[PDB]
Scaffold this active site. Sequence first.
Site, mmCIF file in Angstrom:
data_model
loop_
_atom_site.group_PDB
_atom_site.id
_atom_site.type_symbol
_atom_site.label_atom_id
_atom_site.label_comp_id
_atom_site.label_asym_id
_atom_site.label_seq_id
_atom_site.Cartn_x
_atom_site.Cartn_y
_atom_site.Cartn_z
ATOM 1 C CG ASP A 180 -1.882 -0.742 1.386
ATOM 2 O OD1 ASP A 180 -2.677 -0.891 -0.165
ATOM 3 O OD2 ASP A 180 -2.365 -1.290 2.253
ATOM 4 C CG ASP A 182 2.087 3.968 4.707
ATOM 5 O OD1 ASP A 182 0.823 3.192 4.023
ATOM 6 O OD2 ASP A 182 3.090 4.054 4.870
#
Length: 457
Positions: A180, A182
């Site tokens: 993912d 950030d």
Amino acid sequence: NITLKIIETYLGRVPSVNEYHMLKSQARNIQKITVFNKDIFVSLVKKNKKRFFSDVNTSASEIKDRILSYFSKQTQTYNIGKLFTIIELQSVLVTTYTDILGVLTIKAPNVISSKISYNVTSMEELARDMLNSMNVAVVSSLVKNVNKLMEEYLRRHNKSCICYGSYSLYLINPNIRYGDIDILQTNSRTFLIDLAFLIKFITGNNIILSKIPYLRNYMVIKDENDNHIIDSFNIRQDTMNVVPKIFIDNIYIVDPTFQLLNMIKMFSQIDRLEDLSKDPEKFNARMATMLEYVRYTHGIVFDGKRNNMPMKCIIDENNRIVTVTTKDYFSFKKCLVYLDENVLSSDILDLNADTSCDFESVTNSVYLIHDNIMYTYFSNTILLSDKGKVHEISARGLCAHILLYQMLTSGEYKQCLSDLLNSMMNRDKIPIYSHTERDKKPGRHGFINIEKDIIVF
């Protein structure tokens, strides 16, 4: 009444006495909606489909069909409340879609990026060392598609959305596995609401924008089945401007010097020492890369020299604070670190002189210099090597916390950071005697649902 004619147009029916009374104030937004060119729009949605979701079964009609239905659902709706949601979400689309996701269909220059390559290898052992002294404890399928969009989005919105974490460091060392991405935004909601629609429109499956309260302006979009898709923290332009940055191939990333600082604080949080014992290597790479960045960039040399770091961290086992003299590195005596946020604002007005800083989720605390003293809040478990004794690990996380302030304000921090980094070499594994608990924080777990029209806070 022009207003009445607007409401009537939109609702495709003669507005009730109540529908007029409850919708007046929104004529301004409602009109903008009516005038919105849904064609040029339907265009952008498809220019994003074959651009990031090219892998999906959908006619350039099935899409325009969902889109046109949505921009007309305000007709088959009589619940005031639900009409409010449609107006709210429609407005966001109408006034922001183009500037946010629409900009992702205009190819940017083929910048022949240069980047720098790092010998994050000489440092691979040095990291593994530090990390051992401390190891002393005890998802939708769209994510690929969405991370792919962020790859681009970061490139098209440098001034409103910056990066950190895994991917931010994969941009320095390509071998860092990353998942993912950030991010920090000054328009988190606006973004998530737009992307949330993009997906429901393409996919056809309603997603939920949810807000977590513990966290400072945290938000995330999941799917009907409660599966994480993409999240983001919101910050002010105020804060955005002061965050340490680096500019790699068309995107801004929090300065790795800063991220390293944060990662030293994060090591105090018992959950982390637990993630460490699972796969110690997991962190090796990151740490390494950050050690090498700060070495090569600031001329930091790991001599494993002296002491003078960690300094003193005197803790009130009860009043829960931690006076820590700083006589050494900065022009302020010591620092009082409150373990309870509430107790910080409480006692922070008993000073009156207010010229504090709130760095939201970036520092996850507030800082106030007063009397040549510093008042701040620490949001992690304080570890003790022995009764009434702060553990080196927390001792260090306490220093880094204070240093985060220094970086966001432009104060000296290079020397202190080095002492801090070397204080971490060759140190005997000390036992976690016991630890405190993070303070509880109730709130409103509300959330925007993309199709059933309900807004919980």
